[PDB]
A paper describes a structure:
The binding domain 1 of the bromodomain‐containing protein 4 (Brd4‐BD1) that recognizes acetylated lysine residues, was chosen as model system, due to the availability of a large set of in‐house protein–ligand co‐crystal structures. Brd4‐BD1 contains three tryptophans, yielding a total of nine signals. In the following, we show that, in the case of Brd4‐BD1 ligand complexes, the CH‐groups of Trp81 are sensitive reporters for favorable CH–π contacts and can be easily monitored with 2D 1H‐13C HSQC NMR experiments. In order to provide a comprehensive assessment, we selected a set of 13 ligands for which both crystal structures and affinity data were available.
Ligand 3 is representative of ligands with optimal stacking geometries that lead to substantial upfield shifts of the involved tryptophan CH protons upon ligand binding. The presence of aromatic ring systems above the ζ‐ and the η‐CH groups of Trp81 leads to substantial upfield shifts of ΔωH−η=1.69 ppm and ΔωH−ζ=2.3 ppm, respectively. To demonstrate the relevance of CSPs for the identification of favourable CH–π interactions and their contribution to binding affinity, we analyzed a matched ligand pair (ligands 3 and 4), which are structurally identical except for the interaction interface with Trp81‐η (methoxy propyl vs. phenyl). ITC measurements were carried out to extract binding affinities and thermodynamic parameters.
Residue numbers in the entry: 42 to 168
The structure:
């Protein structure tokens, strides 16, 4: 079974805006998470074909990854900080849905989510 197209990362029809919260999500949240030792399985869309997971896109209907989130922030795709936070939440929930609790990949996602929530707790007020 083939891979689906990756999630949309740029749309010229969508309105664009610069806010302190979106800047914090790219410069602090995405940067700190990308550098983490457990980031590598979440840095790109799941390649179900290469990893031989034919049931991945049969179970996960709303895929998300940090590579997509990074591209979305770089292309001013998000209007609200909540849209970006929702994508990170979707990425973590997808990992917990597809894999069994206690599996190494789940433990990896749990450590990244713990760091993510701490950085979202330090999110600055809207300017
Ligand atoms: C996101 C996300 N949510 N669930 C998964 C998931 N589930 C499997 C562990 C069943 N795997 C990956 C996932 N993303 C990957 C990215 N690259 C590879 N590589 C294998 C080929 O050589 C080079 C390259 C580095 C393997 C990957 N895997 C699995 C195979 C894996 C294996 C060991 C440790 C952690 C993950 C993401 N996932």
């Amino acid at each position: 079974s083939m891979n689906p197209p990756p999630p949309e990362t740029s749309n010229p029809n969508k309105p664009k805006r610069q806010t302190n919260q979106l800047q914090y999500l790219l410069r602090v949240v995405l940067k700190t998470l990308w550098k983490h030792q457990f980031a590598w399985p979440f840095q790109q869309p799941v390649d179900a074909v290469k990893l031989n997971l034919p049931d991945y896109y049969k179970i996960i209907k709303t895929p998300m990854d940090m590579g997509t989130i990074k591209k979305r922030l770089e292309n001013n795709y998000y209007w609200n900080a909540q849209e970006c936070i929702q994508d990170f939440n979707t990425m973590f929930t997808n990992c917990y849905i597809y894999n069994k609790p206690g599996d190494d990949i789940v433990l990896m996602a749990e450590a990244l989510e713990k760091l993510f929530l701490q950085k979202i707790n330090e999110l600055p007020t809207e300017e």
